[PDB]
Amino acid sequence: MLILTRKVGESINIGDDITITILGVSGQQVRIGINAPKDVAVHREEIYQRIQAGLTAPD
Template structure:
């Protein structure tokens, strides 16, 4: 796992076509803006874990 620090407005690029940008909300929380092709499935971590727990049963 790569751990990298990014400030609001900065981003990382994964492969040739996925861009993950750090944005700051009005509350001061950090959010991620993900720009990826429509055929790439993106899910939140808690949903991913729920799906995989159900598969293990």
């Protein structure tokens, strides 16, 4: 697992299509923005396990 230490306003890049930015912080919560193409899905882990429960359709 690759650990990185960002600060408010800084960004990560993944592959050649996806970019991530930490838009700010509000105490114990962190406001993160994801900029992936609609060709790939983006979801929280609280919901990803509902997707992979056995619903939605393949590409």
